[PDB]
Design a protein around this ligand. Structure first.
Ligand code: 118
Ligand SMILES: [Mg+2]
Ligand SMILES: [Zn+2]
Ligand SMILES: [Zn+2]
Lengths: 465, 1338, 49
DNA sequence: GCCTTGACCCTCCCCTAAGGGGAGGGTTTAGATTGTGTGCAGTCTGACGCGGCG
């Protein structure tokens, strides 16, 4: 396309959308709102396996009268306890049921945007619906291994009848030998189908009404999603016009844009058109919040917490005006007196605001000598020290041979020489069954002999450290 | 231990099995307590502990528990060194493309899928779709779409087809394809379309698919899903003094990847619109590309100081990468440097070393020696004794350095005599003292230079420093076999002043008993050094079987030569000292002393010469004054007599008699002549102008002027510089190259003007600027030569060939420039040559031609010998000792195990800084010989020949060719063959602006083959009235007329074409445009009459172009095969030409532009190789048409043409080594059951040792052709990827070696230098050999 | 180098025919570069930066 | 000499009553505002290989 720049590639794919007018955003928000309540409608007459609000009003048990908070919850359930008495009559799809449960929907429409409370009721069937799905997958991974059979008669009448296994009698009807080529495995089909039939027991309702109105419940959750998408896609110029005042502060342009878009996606989710204000006035807050939060979390090699960021910024703002006013830079005393903090903290803050230098920094007249060439390894031992360590080990091994073997084993155990660990008196006397005190006696013996001048001046040579 | 190195692509499971855990966030370290944050880039749970045997919290310590893993902080208790070995990884949220396998041309993805790079770079930016599956539809695999066409296909076809976008699409394409089926269907469907343009790409794609199938790789691993992370200690974060930190750039580049991958993992959970997820995937791709190779696919990401960040690929490649900076040369311990100065009292094996330098460099030796004598109890007391500088320390130091050699080195090291081993002598002071005779191999002097000192530590290094590198084994040069220790500046002046003579010297006439009496008389004050006397002298010789026989005589000589004779050793003749000696005579002395006596007498004799030269130069008293520069008294008149001429040649321009150009070009030479007159007057007034009188009266002798004495002896100076001191300076050039008109008529003894000085500064700066900007070209050429030649080593003793090359002298360009003796000395004879009779055998036919054999060849006269060469050696992977010949620095047959490639490269490269960057007469009398000839008698009683390529040679008294020319075609030879003519006689006459082309036989000329309206005019010379039908230019062209190119032909009394004796030939030739023909119609001519006529950078660049095998921009055209020539189908893009064998097929005909004047007419019969035009020849054609020896001979002669023009001497096998290395590849023509392809390029040794085994058990082998590659294209085409990767272009080498799946066997010298092993050459050759034997054992 | 306009040519070295090719450059203290040039077939061309 | 008592002694860590001070982390904020920007860098010459268009 004759270009490889991704900022132009973005600003080009972003310009194929039109800006909205004051009525466009209102009637987009209206359908965003009514799809999410069409869903809440569809959740209404699902069986008691849902987490329905019977005692959610009691689970929790603008400051509204307690008598108002206790009473208006009695309207809905006062009609609901008598309404779904008709769950039995004429199957599961009775028309009085649709009429009065969409009258419960007439009641339901009153409400508007809410936290994940509503979410946790539709999840009430998530954990239950896909379950059903996956179980009828199991039957299939138990049929295809043994026999091959055309799927569009079987699964079609599977969708249709759901009364009993009598639809398998529709498999032999065409009189081809693939009818009962299956042998000794159909009880596994009956296994999984029977377990989902006891799932049907706990639900009490057949699958082709639950999935039937889930087909229309999925219409609301998609029709809200699509309107949210085209409410987001029409406002990207706002993000791009805000995020151009945060440049040269540690992030690149497209990073700031992709941080602003995640805030716009929340301003779209929290909007309320009834309050009468435009969309820009509410969205700018979330856009700026996202960009500001990402500048303080990224964009430093060594990360500083947010409270220290605000302290640094405040001290910069004070020193600017004191420099404009005095004509000089103020000493930390003149900053402590006005910032009203203890001077040691003002001295502590002033060290934390420096970014590490690159190891490729050219140092000299040329550019073949770098800063990283003159950096020395500090954790190495000098060879004079290695030789000294080995010579001292040999000298000690020679002096430890003069005195008794049993009387040197105790020194080896007591100072840990040639062993994996140091030991204590009682655990050494464990193997000697000698008293707590005799060990100390023989140690004061050995250490008294070992400094007699017939022996000491070979080891004394080392202690000039 | 290990034996090889492999390279391949890395799967995701391989990258996950190198790692110790996943990096999840950009945290480096805590800002208050600088400890590594968990799961960040410096994490101590993944990468290891930051202190020895400590966890991070502090719970565990003290090396009791060594394998425990702390439960609080997860760090295991171990040593911190492991933070240099452990790696981590990053799991990417969407696959990305590796930039190397996409954008290093040719792209491997576009070559594997057969897609253009534009389509791939459009699918990778979410800018177009691509069809993966066709289903059952009109769309097919790899079809490209746009969004609208994708929507149309969706609403029209639905689910059946499959189209994707981004690197997931490309991974699906690479993953779905089948390689074996595809390559086999490229096999049988190439033979129809095996046209060349398709042939090249089809065979390239075939070998790529076959490489992927055999190597084991999978094509989809070129798309990344897991990323590795380098260990933390190789990209450190380090505190400086002051609390400031410093960091690497890979940290900056890893953080961007991590926190653009995390954001995509967030957006894929918020379920955002796709316009935003696409922007994230693009940003992630760009970030990974900048981490791998920064500036390759766009703009380079820069840091907060506006410099581009360095990447993982910039740390490997280039002049400052790992390879050239840390692996091929290092910094070392036990070494120092200092200023050098001269010590004149030293022996040749000795250097002076300061006491303090030696005390520092030798510290552990002194510690051990101190505590062995019991002088110190422990090493830490020895340290303080040494630090206090007690008196016994200086006595331990003197016996430590006793018999411990020391290596000295001065940069730049142009050849191997730049590092030499000496024995040290402790001195006071701080400068190093160097012997005055080794300053010529070093190129050193004492205007401020500095030298480096190195100490060998082990027993083997000491043995090698004594036996191989000591300065008393290095007296000969390894480029030519000449001595290198010749005396330079004051040895020469002192020896020259002591062996001169003078007239009427004090003490003239006496008769003395020997040299001792002459010395005793000179010291006493009774005689002079220059006095003519008679002395009795005893001298020795050896003709016995190793014994010396003496003889005495009385000789006439001077005192000084009798004094000098006490230095010369026993066995040399007196005639070497009886001259007045100079630099050349002294070099001759040293060389004959080396030839007769040997090495050790030579190294004693050189020292004695140095001492006595210094002593007598001191006693002479030579000085320089202002009166020693004598200006001739008749310069002032030569100057006026040139100025008068330039005035009277200006006034022939002011009156319109001469042009401006000729006026300038005449003033130039009338000033040059006066300059030459002044210079010769000056030099004759100075050279013998001494009138010293004798017993009765005056006479003349050579001068004792100081300047003349130091110029004539060869100590310092020349005539060209005394010319500027005492003559005039001359003519100056502009910076353009133009010469100014008025010259500089002054000299340095008299002083220049402001203007003469100003115009003299131009050339000074031009020279100073050329030097500095030429040194770089010379160094770069040396590096390429070393890289092509580095792995060639003498491997065997005798290969057993009978091939060779024919050595003759070079006699062109004038007199004999190179005798035959200088070109066979040291070589081995290829066949049993015989002195010019018959069966004069001198040979077991393997004969090292040492000096006695060359004398035997020169007492007879033989001028061609067949010798042995390396370009014809039959040994594979090396040369044999007999094809190489003599070791030019040792004087005997080469030893097996020698590194001849590095020596060849260094010898050719070292002198590169001195490179600049109408009728035949006969001199002496001898026979005249002709070759390549075909003759005819003339009408005027002379000889003519109808050969174009003949040769005319002059034969000496005995039959050795002394001069050789070639005559132009059509020329009339003044005299015939077999004549003994004297000098001063012309033998052939040709026109300076014309050459005629003659008839074949006496016949009757007809105007035919041309009409009016043709390329012919009727242009008759109106003043003289002579005109034939004249051939025209293309400006007077009539295109419809050139149907037949005009020529006037010869007929019989039959009216038809004449017989030619021997063959049924057409007697006449058709000539190209603009021919001058004025021969009458109806006026007939004889055989050989004038029918028609023919009207009409050196230095380092040329050497580099010869070794790089460039193609000239006007290459001559040669005959592909032998056959009768004719013009072809005449398709008029430009002219067509064909040749036709008398028996064979002739599909070969090709294009020639009409600007290219042809020299071969339609009746010619040509043989394979001869020219169809003129122009510089191309070496690939010389290798294709003629053999290997022809291109070898051409290259070595054209290279030596440049070196000899400057006075540089290089032997000729040093160029043959390079030519052998440029010929290592072969190309297959017909496989024939040989497991090779039909136009693949293979190594020549592989083909050779395959055919030697196929043909062994009765089978048909392969047929091939040889190739010629330049030095830098043959360095890169070798079969080890480590040498090639460390030479140049590391990216291409590594990507190709990676997808191919190569391995490396570590057989050269550089491979073993990289990994720190013993090289296979020299004292390491035996070791490797033994190892190779175990390769046969297992 | 001063700001202003500079007329230059390559002297028969770029094209194989040995033809000289002229060009002209305008160079400001601050701004962008504008230059005109000739080609083998005698057509004026322009380019920016 | 080769062991057993009964006294004494030391350092290190955790604890008391009623909060105080700070470090480091979470969340929202409703008049409207809808496409970058540096007073860029652009700046060498020669050889070679491949694609795109006549
Ligand atoms: C410079 C420019 C804007 C703000 Sb503000 C703000 C700050 C304090 C009190 C009220 C408003 C802001 C909002 C969110 C995140 C970061 C900064 C602000 C917001 C919307 C419109 C105008 C100003 C601050 C400094
Ligand atoms: Mg010097
Ligand atoms: Zn721990
Ligand atoms: Zn050989």
């Amino acid at each position: 396309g004759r270009t490889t720049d991704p900022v132009r590639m973005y600003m080009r794919e972003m310009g194929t959308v039109e800006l909205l007018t004051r009525e466009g955003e209102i009637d987009i928000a209206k359908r965003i709102e009514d799809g999410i309540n069409q869903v809440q409608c569809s959740v209404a007459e699902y069986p008691e396996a849902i987490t329905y609000l019977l005692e959610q009003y009691d689970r929790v048990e603008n400051s509204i009268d307690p008598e108002l908070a206790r009473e208006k919850f009695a309207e809905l359930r006062a009609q609901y306890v008598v309404t779904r008495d008709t769950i039995k009559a004429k199957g599961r799809s009775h028309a009085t049921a649709q009429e009065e449960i969409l009258k419960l929907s007439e009641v339901f429409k009153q409400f508007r945007l809410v936290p994940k409370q509503f979410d946790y009721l539709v999840n009430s069937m998530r954990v239950m619906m896909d379950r059903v799905r996956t179980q009828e997958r199991l039957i299939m991974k138990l049929c295809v291994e043994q026999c091959k059979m055309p799927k569009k008669n079987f699964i079609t009448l599977f969708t249709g009848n759901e009364t009993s296994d009598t639809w398998f009698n529709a498999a032999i009807a065409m009189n081809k030998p693939w009818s009962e080529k299956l042998h000794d495995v159909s009880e596994e089909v009956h296994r999984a189908l029977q377990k989902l039939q006891q799932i049907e027991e706990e639900t009490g309702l057949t699958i082709e009404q639950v999935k039937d109105i889930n087909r229309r419940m999925s219409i609301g959750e998609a029709k809200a999603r699509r309107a949210k998408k085209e409410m987001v896609e029409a406002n990207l110029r706002l993000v791009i016009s805000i995020a151009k005042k945060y440049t040269n502060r540690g992030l690149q342009f497209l990073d700031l844009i992709q941080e602003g878009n995640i805030g716009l996606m929340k301003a779209v989710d929290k909007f309320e058109y009834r309050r009468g204000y435009k969309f820009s006035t509410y969205a700018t807050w979330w856009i700026r919040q996202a960009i500001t939060r990402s500048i303080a979390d990224q964009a430093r090699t060594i990360r500083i917490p947010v409270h220290m960021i605000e302290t640094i910024n405040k001290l910069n703002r004070i020193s600017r005006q004191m420099l404009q006013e005095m004509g000089r830079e103020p000493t930390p005393e003149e900053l402590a007196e006005r910032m009203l903090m203890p001077e040691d903290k003002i001295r502590k803050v002033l060290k934390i605001a420096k970014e590490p230098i690159s190891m490729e920094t050219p140092i000299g007249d040329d550019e073949d000598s770098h800063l990283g060439d003159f950096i020395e390894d500090t954790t190495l031992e000098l060879p004079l020290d290695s030789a000294t360590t080995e010579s001292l080990r040999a000298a000690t091994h020679d002096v430890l041979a003069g005195l008794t073997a049993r009387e040197a084993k105790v020194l080896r155990m007591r100072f840990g020489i040639d062993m994996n660990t140091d030991y204590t008196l009682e655990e050494v006397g464990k193997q000697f069954d000698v008293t707590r005190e005799r060990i100390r006696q023989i140690e004061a013996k050995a250490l008294r002999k070992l400094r007699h001048p017939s022996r000491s001046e070979v080891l004394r040579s080392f202690l000039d450290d | 231990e290990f034996d090889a190195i492999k390279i391949a692509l890395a799967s995701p499971d391989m990258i996950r099995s190198w790692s110790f855990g996943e990096v999840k966030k950009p945290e480096t370290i805590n800002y208050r307590t600088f400890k590594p944050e968990r799961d960040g880039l410096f994490c101590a749970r993944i990468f290891g502990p930051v202190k020895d045997y400590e966890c991070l919290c502090g719970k565990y310590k003290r090396l009791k528990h060594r394998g425990v893993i702390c439960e609080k902080c997860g760090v295991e208790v171990t040593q911190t060194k492991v933070r240099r070995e452990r790696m981590g990884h990053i799991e990417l949220a969407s696959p990305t493309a590796h930039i190397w396998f996409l954008k290093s041309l040719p792209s491997r993805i576009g070559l594997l899928l057969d897609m253009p790079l534009r389509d791939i770079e459009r699918v990778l930016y979410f800018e177009s779709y691509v069809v993966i599956e066709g289903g059952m539809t009109n769309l097919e695999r790899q079809q490209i779409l746009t969004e609208e066409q994708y929507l149309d296909a969706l609403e029209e076809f639905g689910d059946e087809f499959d189209a994707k976008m981004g690197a997931e699409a490309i991974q699906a394409l690479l993953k779905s394809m089948d390689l074996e089926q595809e390559c086999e269907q490229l096999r049988e469907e190439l033979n129809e379309t095996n046209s060349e343009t398709k042939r090249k790409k089809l065979t390239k794609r075939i070998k790529l698919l076959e490489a992927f199938v055999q190597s084991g790789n999978k094509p989809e691993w070129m798309i990344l899903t897991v990323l590795p992370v380098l260990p933390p200690d190789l990209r450190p974060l380090v505190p400086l003094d002051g609390g400031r930190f410093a960091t690497s750039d890979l940290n900056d580049l890893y953080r961007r990847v991590i926190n653009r991958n995390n954001r995509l993992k967030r957006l894929l959970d918020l379920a955002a619109p796709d316009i935003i997820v696409r922007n994230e995937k693009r940003m992630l791709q760009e970030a990974v590309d900048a981490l791998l190779d920064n500036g390759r696919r766009g703009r380079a990401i820069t840091g907060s100081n506006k410099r581009p960040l360095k990447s993982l690929a910039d740390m490997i490649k280039g002049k400052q990468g790992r390879f050239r900076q840390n692996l091929l040369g290092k910094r070392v311990d036990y070494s120092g440097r200092s200023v050098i100065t001269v010590g004149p009292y030293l022996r040749l094996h000795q250097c002076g070393l300061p006491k303090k330098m030696a005390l520092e460099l030798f510290k552990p030796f002194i510690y051990g020696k101190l505590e062995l004598r019991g002088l110190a109890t422990t090493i830490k007391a020895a340290k303080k004794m040494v630090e206090r500088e007690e008196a016994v320390v200086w006595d331990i130091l003197d016996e430590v350095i006793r018999e411990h050699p020391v290596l000295l080195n001065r940069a730049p090291t142009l050849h191997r005599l730049g590092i030499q081993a000496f024995e040290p002598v402790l001195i006071e002071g701080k400068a190093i003292q160097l012997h005055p005779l080794v300053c010529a191999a070093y190129n050193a002097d004492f205007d401020g230079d500095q030298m480096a000192v190195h100490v060998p530590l082990t027993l083997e290094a000491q043995l090698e420093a004594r036996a191989l590198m000591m300065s008393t084994n290095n007296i000969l040069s390894p480029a030519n076999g000449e001595p290198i220790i010749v005396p330079s500046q004051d040895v020469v002046l002192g020896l020259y002043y002591m062996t001169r003579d003078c007239v009427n010297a004090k003490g003239e006439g006496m008769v003395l008993t020997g040299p001792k009496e002459a010395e005793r008389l000179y010291r006493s004050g009774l005689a002079s050094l220059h006095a003519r006397v008679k002395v009795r002298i005893t001298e020795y010789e050896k003709d016995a079987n190793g014994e010396l026989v003496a003889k005495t005589s009385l000789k006439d000589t001077t005192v000084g030569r009798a004094i000098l004779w006490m230095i010369v050793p026993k066995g040399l003749p007196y005639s070497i000292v009886n001259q007045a000696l100079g630099k050349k005579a002294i070099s001759k002395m040293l060389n004959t002393c080396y030839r007769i006596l040997g090495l050790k007498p030579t190294v004693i004799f050189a020292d004695q010469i140095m001492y006595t030269g210094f002593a007598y130069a001191a006693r002479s008293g030579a000085s320089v004054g202002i009166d020693d520069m004598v200006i001739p008294e008749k310069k002032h008149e030569i100057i006026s007599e040139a100025e008068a001429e330039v005035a009277e040649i200006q006034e022939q321009f002011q009156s319109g008699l001469v042009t401006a150009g000729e006026r300038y070009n005449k003033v130039i030479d009338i000033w040059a002549a006066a300059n030459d007159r002044v210079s010769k007057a000056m030099m004759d007034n100075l050279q013998t102008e001494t009138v010293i009188n004798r017993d009765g009266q005056e006479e003349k002798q050579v001068s004792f002027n100081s300047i003349y004495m130091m110029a004539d002896s060869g100590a310092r100076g020349s005539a060209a510089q005394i010319r500027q001191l005492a003559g005039m300076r001359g003519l100056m050039a502009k910076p353009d190259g133009s010469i100014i008109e008025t010259p500089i008529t002054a000299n340095f003894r008299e002083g220049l003007n402001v203007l003469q000085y100003f115009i003299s500064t131009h050339g000074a700066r031009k020279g100073l600027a050329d030097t500095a900007l030429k040194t770089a070209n010379s160094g770069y050429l040396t590096r390429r030569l070393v890289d092509v030649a580095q792995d060639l080593v003498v491997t065997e003793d005798d290969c057993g060939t009978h091939e060779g090359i024919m050595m003759t002298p070079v006699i062109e360009g004038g007199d004999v420039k190179e005798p035959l003796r200088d070109r066979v000395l040291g070589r081995v004879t290829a066949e049993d040559v015989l002195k010019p009779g018959t069966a004069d055998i001198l040979v077991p036919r393997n004969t090292l031609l040492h000096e006695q054999w060359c004398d035997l060849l020169e007492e007879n006269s033989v001028d061609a010998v067949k010798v042995r060469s390396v370009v014809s050696c039959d040994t594979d992977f090396g040369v044999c000792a007999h094809c190489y010949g003599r070791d030019l620095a040792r004087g005997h047959i080469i030893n097996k195990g020698e590194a001849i490639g590095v020596i060849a490269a260094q010898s050719i490269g070292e002198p590169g800084t001195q490179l600049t960057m109408s009728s035949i007469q006969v001199k002496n009398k001898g026979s005249i010989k002709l070759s390549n000839v075909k003759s005819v008698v003339n009408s005027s009683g002379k000889l003519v020949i109808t050969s174009r390529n003949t040769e005319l040679k002059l034969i000496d008294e005995f039959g050795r060719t002394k001069e050789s020319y070639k005559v132009p075609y059509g020329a009339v030879l003044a005299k015939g063959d077999g004549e003994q003519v004297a000098g001063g006689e012309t033998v052939a006459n040709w026109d300076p602006h014309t050459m005629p082309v003659i008839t074949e036989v006496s016949g009757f000329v007809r105007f035919t083959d041309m009409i009016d309206g043709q390329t012919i005019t009727r242009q008759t010379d109106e003043l003289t009235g002579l005109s034939s039908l004249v051939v025209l230019d293309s400006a007077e062209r009539t295109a419809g007329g050139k149907d037949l190119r005009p020529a006037l032909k010869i007929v019989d009394a039959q009216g038809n074409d004449v017989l030619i004796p021997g063959t049924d030939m057409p007697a006449q030739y058709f000539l190209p445009g603009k021919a001058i023909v004025q021969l009458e119609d109806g006026v007939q001519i004889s055989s050989g009459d004038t029918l028609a006529r023919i009207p009409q950078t050196g230095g380092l660049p040329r050497v580099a172009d010869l070794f790089e095998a460039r193609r000239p921009k006007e290459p001559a055209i040669l005959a592909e095969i032998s056959g009768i020539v004719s013009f072809g189908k005449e398709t008029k893009g430009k002219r067509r030409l064909v040749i036709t064998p008398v028996d064979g097929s002739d599909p070969y005909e090709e294009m020639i532009p009409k600007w290219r004047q042809l020299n071969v007419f339609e009746g010619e019969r040509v043989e394979r190789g001869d020219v169809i035009s003129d122009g510089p020849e191309a070496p690939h054609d010389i290798l294709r048409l003629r053999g290997v020896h022809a291109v070898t001979r051409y290259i070595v002669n054209e290279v030596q043409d440049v070196y000899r023009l400057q006075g540089v001497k290089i032997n000729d096998k040093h160029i043959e080594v390079i030519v052998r290395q440029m010929l290592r590849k072969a190309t297959i023509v017909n496989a024939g059951s040989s497991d090779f392809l039909e136009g693949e390029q293979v190594e020549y040794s592989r083909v050779k040792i395959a055919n030697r085994e196929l043909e062994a058990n009765g089978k048909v082998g392969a047929t091939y052709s040889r190739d010629l590659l330049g030095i830098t294209k043959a360095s890169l085409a070798t079969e080890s990827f480590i040498s090639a990767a460390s030479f140049q272009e590391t990216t291409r080498v590594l990507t190709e070696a990676a997808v191919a799946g190569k391995r490396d066997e570590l057989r050269g010298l550089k491979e073993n230098v990289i990994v720190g092993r013993l090289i296979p050459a020299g004292t390491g050759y035996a070791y490797h050999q033994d190892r190779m034997r175990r390769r046969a054992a297992g | 180098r001063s700001p202003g306009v500079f007329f230059d040519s390559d002297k028969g070295k770029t094209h194989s025919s040995g033809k000289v090719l002229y060009n002209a450059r305008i160079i400001p203290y601050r701004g962008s570069w504008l230059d005109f040039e000739f080609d083998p077939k005698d057509n004026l061309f322009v380019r920016i930066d």
